[PDB]
Amino acid sequence: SKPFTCLDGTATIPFDQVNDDYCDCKDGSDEPGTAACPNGSFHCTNTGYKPLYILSSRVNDGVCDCCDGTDEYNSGTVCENTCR
């Protein structure tokens, strides 16, 4: 099983350092699902409305940023789906 690179070409890391809650890529590409990278983005799939991107700092911050609520998965804030 192969390792992961980075969309900017700044290095390559083992596959266990993708979404491990530490920032290893200068462009933040290794942490799409966490709040670890300052310049990352989290993708809200948002079925039933427009898909949206939010800042990585708004993942598990306790605030509901996606209408589907998937940005809050381990924060103590439960977001109801509101894409209607």
Binding site: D20, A36, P38, S57, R58, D61, G62, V63, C64
Partner: protein, 854 residues
């Protein structure tokens, strides 16, 4: 400012009388036959040789190396005022004994030494000694003056159009103190003046009388909104402090004379009650004073973030647009503020029915962003028979009264208004209960309070405040209590925010007027500054002078209150405000809107960067505030506090320190190309926290700057904790991992602390639910241990990164945690900067651990 509104010393009849007494042989002498050594104190009678008025001197040696001097009349016609509620406790005494004597001298020893007090009988004099070293003298210039209560403008007196019936006649008290070897003094806020106090010999004394001064000017000794009667003397050899416990109008004279500084306090009424705090170090003085008046109240974490305010946000929609603007422009903010226009025609505890019809929904919208709100509540109550607050206070007789017995009525924002008597504890209890969620309708747990105009400001009153002859609880005159009226407001408000929570939630209250002991109740700010470069500059000496006297939670309006700052000025004010304790932008009603995203992107980006630097240092800011809360040590510090023997730091006020780890010299000149940074300390190093460049002290370094520069340096030997994941507010960040910044000393060592709790309750003291971590570096090992084992906390916070400045490349890095196998960590090293970064230690902050560089 219009100076004719405010008395000079000559226009204050008691100031004129006192100041006319010039240095010479005192007519007071001590009757040594009357000497008595009691359980707590020494009492001896004093007599004026010409008038034969009899005074009583109560002399006390105190635990923690302090002396208290109290002088009152022997048989007074009526009682004199003694300041209540400011001392946190009855100060523990130390036994006095007579260790020397002659026909004109009694020498007293405090406990078993080395402190001694010589009481000279004729003329009356006091000398305080450590062993055979003279620390300080009392009445050495012979300036003791004590106007006894004569049998009922020395009496009735007029100023401008205002009349003082003055029923008790001249009653002022004054006393002088001599500081051998001291050439610098600091303290006695609030004045828009330099940190090092100036000699008053050829001009006005410093005035201490809480007053509302419209468009106040710089570098003058006029009294401002708060008064803390504490003066600090510093030399290469010792530190001392004088605490003149008096609540009436007080003037302070300062003269220099081998080097010596003399200090003379002159007060309108009450007794003489002064505390001499003998050090010897400045941190000993901090401790001595803290034991008397208390320590800085631990702020809830959110109040150490960024506050966005102005006079005024228009309606609920405006407030929510401001909230959304921060998030749309990726800028952190914790609190949005609501000035006087949010209420119904300046009737406090109300909401405008059109512009704020659903306050709970507004607060609920802010809670979902995990942000707070502050609403202003002033202590003047509109005289309005439809206003429920006014009807209750009038029906229960809780108002300040006039001599005829009717409730005092003055003028303020709602027009004609009455003033609750906050010196009456029944009134304070009423006020506190008013903040319960049932009484303050529309309030919610994320609504906090701002007390303004609590000098009190009275537009038609003398010097814009209350008449000297208004009457308060117990029959005391307003002239007796003036300077603690605001403190009572701040205290009652703060206790109300605690009570409405059932005693669980910590308060946040900002207050404009203040006194000794105000540090116990929240924050203060320097009132109505102006959008000008010199007002930006003066924020440092003003907050520094408040720091030295216990008020660590200080700030100035970012941007200036009056007028419109130019974009370069606003950026510099943000960078300055981001490194000062209370961090709030505020603005006058007629100024242009200056929310930070309304500027061009270059100014926006520099402002965003300053906000990010602030939010990342919150763990550091929070720890300094915990140390201020436990020890009495100031958060913002003059350089001479950290380098007491470097005489070139004694006057510096374009630079300051945060604890002992960060030295700050913000840019405060338009178009500056550089700054001159004095880095102190023999064999001390400093790290440019932007370039990681190391610099060797002592030196003056020319640092080039751009618009984005905030000149900040970390001291070698310190460890600073940061949250590198900046989010939209502090509530969002308070479970996030910490990064540790280790600046290595020249000996390869460093240390620092970290405090943690839930961020807002009193559980840290009632349940010991907190963490105090000590991080230490030496040899080649970083160790985390507990600095207080009583503290336990359930927290997800972990150590995600360690940044070490001044280190070589290791061959391996090894982590050891109790409960875990020995782990290997990867790292990066820049040979150009000698910066070492340890990747993802992954360890809980509650755990003990060590990292070794091989």
């Amino acid at each position: 400012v219009d100076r004719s509104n405010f008395k000079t010393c000559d226009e204050s009849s008691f100031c004129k009388r006192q100041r006319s007494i010039r240095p010479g042989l005192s007519p007071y002498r001590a009757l040594l036959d009357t000497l008595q050594l009691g359980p707590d104190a020494l009492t001896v009678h004093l007599i004026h040789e010409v008038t034969k008025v009899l005074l009583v001197l109560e002399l006390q040696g105190l635990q923690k190396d302090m002396t208290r001097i109290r002088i009152d009349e022997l048989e007074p016609r009526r009682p004199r005022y003694r300041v209540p509620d400011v001392l946190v406790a009855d100060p523990p005494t130390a036994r006095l004994s007579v260790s020397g004597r002659d026909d004109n001298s009694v020498e007293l020893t405090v406990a078993e030494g080395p402190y001694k007090i010589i009481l000279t009988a004729q003329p009356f004099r006091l000398d305080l000694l450590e062993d055979r070293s003279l620390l300080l003298s009392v009445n050495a210039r012979g300036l003791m003056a004590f106007e006894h209560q004569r049998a009922p403008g020395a009496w009735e007196e007029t100023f401008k159009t205002h009349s003082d019936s003055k029923p008790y006649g001249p009653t002022s008290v004054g006393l002088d103190f001599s500081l051998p070897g001291m050439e610098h003094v600091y303290g006695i806020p609030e004045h828009a003046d330099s940190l090092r106090l100036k000699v008053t010999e050829g001009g006005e004394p410093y005035r201490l009388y809480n007053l509302d001064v419209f468009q106040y000017e710089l570098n003058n000794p006029m009294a401002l909104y708060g008064s803390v009667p504490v003066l600090l003397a510093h030399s290469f050899h010792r530190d001392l402090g004088i605490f003149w416990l008096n609540a009436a109008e007080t003037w302070v004279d300062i003269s220099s004379n081998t080097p010596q500084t003399d200090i003379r306090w002159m007060s309108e009424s009450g007794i003489i009650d002064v505390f001499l705090m003998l050090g010897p170090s400045v941190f000993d003085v901090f401790r001595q004073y803290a034991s008397l008046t208390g320590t800085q109240a631990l702020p809830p974490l959110f109040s150490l973030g960024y506050h966005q305010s102005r006079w005024n946000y228009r309606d609920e929609a405006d407030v929510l647009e401001v909230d959304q603007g921060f998030d749309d422009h990726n800028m952190p903010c914790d609190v949005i503020w609501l000035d006087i226009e949010h209420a119904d025609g300046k009737r406090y505890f109300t909401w405008d029915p059109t512009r704020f019809p659903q306050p709970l929904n507004m607060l609920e919208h802010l809670a979902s962003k995990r942000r707070k709100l502050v609403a202003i509540v002033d202590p003047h109550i509109k005289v309005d028979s439809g206003y429920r607050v006014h009807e209750e206070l009038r029906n229960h007789g809780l108002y300040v009264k006039t001599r005829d017995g009717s409730d005092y009525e003055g003028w303020c924002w709602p027009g004609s208004a009455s003033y609750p008597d906050f010196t009456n504890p029944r009134m304070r209890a009423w006020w506190s209960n008013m903040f319960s969620f049932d009484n303050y309708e529309g309030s919610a747990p994320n609504l906090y309070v701002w007390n303004d105009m609590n000098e009190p400001s009275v537009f038609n009153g003398p010097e814009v405040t209350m008449l000297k002859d208004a009457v308060h609880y117990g029959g005391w005159e307003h002239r007796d209590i003036h300077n603690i009226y605001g403190l009572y407001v701040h205290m009652a408000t703060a206790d109300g925010l605690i009570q409405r929570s059932g005693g669980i939630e910590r308060p946040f209250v900002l207050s404009r007027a203040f006194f000794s002991g105000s540090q116990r109740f929240g924050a203060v700010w320097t009132g109505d500054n102006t959008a000008e470069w010199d007002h930006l500059k003066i924020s440092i000496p003003m907050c520094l002078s408040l720091a030295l006297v216990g008020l660590s939670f200080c700030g100035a309006d970012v941007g200036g209150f009056f007028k419109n700052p130019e974009p370069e000025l606003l950026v510099r004010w943000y960078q300055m405000g981001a490194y000062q304790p209370f961090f709030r932008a505020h603005a006058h009603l007629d100024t242009g809107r200056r929310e930070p995203w309304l500027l061009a992107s270059q100014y926006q980006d520099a402002i965003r960067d300053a906000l990010f630097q602030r939010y990342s240092l919150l763990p550091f800011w929070y720890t300094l505030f915990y140390q201020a809360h436990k020890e009495g040590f100031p958060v913002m510090r003059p350089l001479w506090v950290q380098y007491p023997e470097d005489m070139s730091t004694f006057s510096i006020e374009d630079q300051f320190m945060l604890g002992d780890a960060l030295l700050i010299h913000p840019v405060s000149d338009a178009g500056a190309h550089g700054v001159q940074v004095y880095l102190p300390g023999q064999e001390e190093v400093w790290y440019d926290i932007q370039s990681y460049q190391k610099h060797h002290g002592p030196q003056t370094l020319y640092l080039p700057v751009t618009l984005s520069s905030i000149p900040v340096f970390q001291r070698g030997g310190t460890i600073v904790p940061r949250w590198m994941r900046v989010r939209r507010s502090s509530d969002c960040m308070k479970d996030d991992p910490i990064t540790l910044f280790v600046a290595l000393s020249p000996q390869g060592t460093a240390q620092g602390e970290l405090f943690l709790d839930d961020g807002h309750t009193f559980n840290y003291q009632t349940r010991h639910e907190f963490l105090l971590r000590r991080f230490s570096f030496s040899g080649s090992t970083l160790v985390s241990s507990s600095a207080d084992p009583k503290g336990h906390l359930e927290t997800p916070i972990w150590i995600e990164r360690v940044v070490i400045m001044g280190a070589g490349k290791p061959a391996a890095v090894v982590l050891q945690t109790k409960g875990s196998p020995e782990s290997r960590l990867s790292f990066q090293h820049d040979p150009e900067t000698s910066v070492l970064i340890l990747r993802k230690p992954g360890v809980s902050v509650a755990s003990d651990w060590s990292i070794h560089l091989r």
